[PDB]
Structure formats: C-alpha cells, structure tokens
Amino acid sequence: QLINTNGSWH
Amino acid sequence: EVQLSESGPSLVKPSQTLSLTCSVTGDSITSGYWNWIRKFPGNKLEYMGYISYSGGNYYNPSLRSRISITRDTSKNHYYLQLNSVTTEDTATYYCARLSDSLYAMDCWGQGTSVTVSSASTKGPSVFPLAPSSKSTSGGTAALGCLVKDYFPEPVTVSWNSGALTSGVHTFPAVLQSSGLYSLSSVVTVPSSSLQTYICNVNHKPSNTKVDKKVEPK
Amino acid sequence: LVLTQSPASLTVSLGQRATMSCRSSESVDAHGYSFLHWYQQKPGQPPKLLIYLASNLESGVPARFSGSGSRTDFTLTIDPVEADDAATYSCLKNNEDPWTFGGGTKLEITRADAAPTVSIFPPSSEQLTSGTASVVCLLNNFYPREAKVQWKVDNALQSGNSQESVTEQDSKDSTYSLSSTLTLSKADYEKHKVYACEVTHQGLSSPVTKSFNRGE
C-alpha cells in the first residue's frame, strides 16, 4: 500500500 | 519462482558505455521495483538505482550523471546503461526485484562480472601441477592445474566435467605485474587411485576452453 | 556517518551467539515501519535477504536469525551460530534518498587447530619452454587463517617475487587453504638447484619445509 518515488516512500 | 538472468559484455574500454540486460521470469515488471546493485572487489555493496512499475526511475546520486535504467514490458526485460566508465566501475553487477510487500530486495540474479580496461582479451595457458611424493601425505595426494595469464575475469575450473567436486580448492585469482590474472586449482585425492583426473578450464571472455589431463610424474 | 556497522570483523565458535549492530545516524522509520534489512553475502553468490523491515524473518531463513532494532539502532542476532553462517552480513537502508549499504560484518567461525598439509609443485616442462618458471606451494585445510610461508632458494630467502591467495572459510569444516606461487624467469630458475617452502603455523610444532631438487 506504500509506493516509492525518488527513493522516498509515501 | 521469480528468475533473473543477466547478460552483456564482460570487458568495456574506458569512457565507453557499459550495457547489461536483466530478463525476469515470474512476475511482471509492471509490478514492483526492479533494481541494479553492484559488488566491488573490496566486498562492498553499492546500490545503483531502479525502474518502477510505472516506469519511474530513482538513481544513486553519485551515478545520476552517467546512469540509465530502461525497460521493455513486451519482452519483460529491463536494461542498465553506464556511460563514461572508468576502472572504478569494475564490479559484479546484480539485478534484483524489490517486493511491494517486503519493501526490500528478495529475488536476485547470480550476477555478471564486468571489467573496465583498454587491454584486449587473452586466453589462459594451462599447466599441470603433477602429483608426486612432495604432494602425498598419508593416503592422500595433491594435484592441480595452473591457469596463468588470462584477462579479464572470470575463469571457471571444474574437475572431470563436474564429477569430481570433493576436495577441490579453486583459489581466488591474483593480478600479476603484467596486467594478466593467474589462478591455481588443486584437488586432494586418495593416492591409491592415481582414475583419470582432468581439469576443465573455461574463459568465456575469450571463448577459450582447455581440458588438461594431470598424470603422475 | 550515514550507515555504520559493528563489529567490522567477528570470530565466534559453533553453537554460540553472534550479535551485530547497524547505526543509522538518522531515523529510517516511516509509516510505522523500520526500513532496515539484513543481508547475508557468501563468495560467488548474490546477497541473500535474511531480515526485512528490522524484525521479520524472510521465508526459508532459519529461526536462528532475528532482528529487533528501532529508529536508529538495529541488531542482528545469530544463535546458535552454525558452520554455514561464515559470511559477510550487511544492513540496507531504504527509507529515503540515498539508499546505502553498510560496510559489512565479516563473521569467522572458531574451531580446533588444524595443521596444514604442505605440498610443493615444480614448474611444468611446458612452461619452462616458454621462458618462465612458477613454483607453487600448497597449504591445505588449516585453521587458524594466520600462517607464514617463506621461500628458500639455495638457502637464500626470496622477497618480492612471490604472490599468494587464500580461499574463503570452508562452509563445512571452517578451514582455510593457501597457495603460494614463486615466479621466476627461465634463466633465474636454472641458476639454482634447491627450492624450499617453509611453513610456520600455530597448529604445527615446528616449521615444515617441503622442498625439491631441480632435475630430480
């Protein structure tokens, strides 16, 4: 349920 | 079972482009995160980057200037490109999947060795290490093969086409002062069996395959 | 200071407890998860995931491995240690940019001393024709790793003309194997008659000298 964008999870 | 196979050249000249391919067989690359990790000779692990399920990219800051990770969903493959390589880029490159559930990398490929150098490939000479009284102790005798003067890594050594595995010691290669690598592979066998012993030397970078029979002196 | 592993190297006996720590320097916690994972790396094999998210055991990994760290302090515990556990272990941080690996913890197994079986191999005739002689000395299945190998040619002790490499710690019996290669030109090889390999090791009462005579 978490996605990663540019190294950060959100 | 997710399966990751890596292919590509093992020798790249400096400043040129290194290109590797990772074929995945288990889940789609339209799901999860697909990363590239490399292993320096010092045993240190450096993370390079990934391509996401939607095609997004995240790269290590120290590689962001000359790295590129693309994909091909129809072939279910994703690719690694490294521009302007130097000798500091000589490492063992892995491709691995980062699971959405685990949030860590759980499935890896076996890795492929890449060497950055301007020297051309060169096949190895294979010399016998003949067993004798100076290699016998008790009821066991030592023999082997000297795989000398090859470039670049790696060289795989088996005994009797893989049938003989117990007591085999294939040493890590050493870099000689001439720029070529040299390694030795030995095996200890019962002295009463001096059975045919043949070492199988394979150097894929130069398409060289040598079978050398080691007979007693 | 981004990721510090401790200890750098570790030496534990079989059936005992090994404890390692990974220092984050800043929290890797987000959304109630600790984005720190423990990997085991063996020679000629890719890194293997042991613990994911600080404390969860990965499928197929024995219950001997456990993790429990939080915010900035993490710990990996191996209890009891097995012979197969001899490897390098790394912690991975992936909460935010940059994703980094720890320096690693090299774990070595301790066992009873094993004396090396010394062998020496004269250079082959095929190589002597080329114009180079390689003399190989073999130390087989010994512990501990520390050992001294000295080449004696005409009772003189060589220096700078030899190289050696050591195998990794064996997964079954926790032993080491070493090979020393003495490289000389064909001219230098034919200037001497006796080539000796002197071996000093903890498991040997006195140094063992394995030698041969050229031409015999």
Contacts with B33 from chain A: Cβ below 8 Å: 4
State both tokens at B176.
């000689």
Q: How many residues does chain A have?
A: 10
Residue of C29, C179, C185 to mutate for B, most B C-beta atoms under 10 A: C179
Mark whether C190 and C125 lie in a shared domain: yes
C185-193 contacts, C-beta under 8 A, 24 or more apart: C185/C131, C185/C132, C185/C133, C186/C128, C186/C130, C186/C131, C186/C132, C186/C133, C188/C133, C189/C123, C189/C128, C189/C133, C189/C214, C190/C214, C192/C153, C192/C154, C193/C154
C-alpha distance from residue C158 to each of B213, C44, C103, C182, C197 (Å): 31, 33, 36, 9, 10
| Percent helix, strand and coil across chain C, each to the nearest 5 | 5, 50, 45
Which domain covers residue C46, as residue numbers?
A: 1-111
Q: What is the C-alpha separation between B43 and B21, in angstroms, rounded?
A: 23
Mark whether C57 and C128 lie in a shared domain: no
Q: What is the C-alpha separation between B177 and B197, in angstroms, rounded?
A: 31
Total domain count, chain C: 2
Contact criterion met (CB below 8 Å) for B129 and B185: no
Last residue of some domain: C94, C111, C128?
Answer: C111
Q: What is the C-alpha separation between B27 and C94, in angstroms, rounded?
A: 22
Mark whether C101 and C145 lie in a shared domain: no
Resolution in angstroms, to 1 decimal, for this deposition? Answer: 2.7
Chain-centre distance for alpha carbon C201: 17
- Topology of the domain covering B119-215: Immunoglobulin-like (2.60.40)
Mark whether C36 and C64 lie in a shared domain: yes
Q: How many residues does chain C have?
A: 216
Calculate how close chain B gets to C75, using CA atoms only, in Å.
17
Contact criterion met (CB below 8 Å) for B17 and B3: no
SS3 C166: strand
E strand or H helix at B147, and its extent? strand B140-150
The CATH number of the domain where C57 resides is what?
Answer: 2.60.40.10
Search chain B and give the residue with CA nearest C33.
Answer: B103
CA angle C131, C180, B186 (to 5 degrees): 90
Instruction: Specify the DSSP class assigned to residue B177.
Output: T
Name which of B18, B8, B6 is nearest B116 in CA terms: B18
Mark whether C16 and C78 lie in a shared domain: yes
SS3 B62: helix
DSSP per-residue codes, C115-154: --EEEEEPPPHHHHHHTEEEEEEEEEEEBSS-EEEEEEET
Mark whether C10 and C107 lie in a shared domain: yes
SS3 B135: helix
Name which of C7, C177, C15 is nearest C88 in CA terms: C7
Cα dihedral: C182, C185, C189, C195 (round 10): -10
Last residue of some domain: C87, C111, C135?
Answer: C111
CA angle B191, B197, B199 (to 5 degrees): 135
Mark whether C101 and C118 lie in a shared domain: no
Last residue of some domain: C111, C139, C167?
Answer: C111
Q: Is B114 exposed, middle or buried (0-12, 13-18, 19+ CB in 10 A)?
A: buried
Mark whether C60 and C143 lie in a shared domain: no
| Percent helix, strand and coil across chain A, each to the nearest 5 | 0, 40, 60
Mark whether C106 and C129 lie in a shared domain: no
Mark whether C54 and C125 lie in a shared domain: no
Contact criterion met (CB below 8 Å) for C147 and C165: no
Q: How was this structure determined?
A: X-ray
Q: Label each residue of B90-101 as H, E or C.
A: CEEEEEEEECCC
Mark whether C165 and C80 lie in a shared domain: no
Contact criterion met (CB below 8 Å) for C41 and C88: yes
Contacts with B144 from chain C: Cβ below 8 Å: 121, 136, 138
- Token match 């990790």: residue? B37
DSSP per-residue codes, B200-212: EEEEGGGTEEEEE
Search chain B and give the residue with CA nearest A3.
Answer: B100
Mark whether C133 and C104 lie in a shared domain: no
Residues of chain B with CATH 2.60.40.10: 119-215
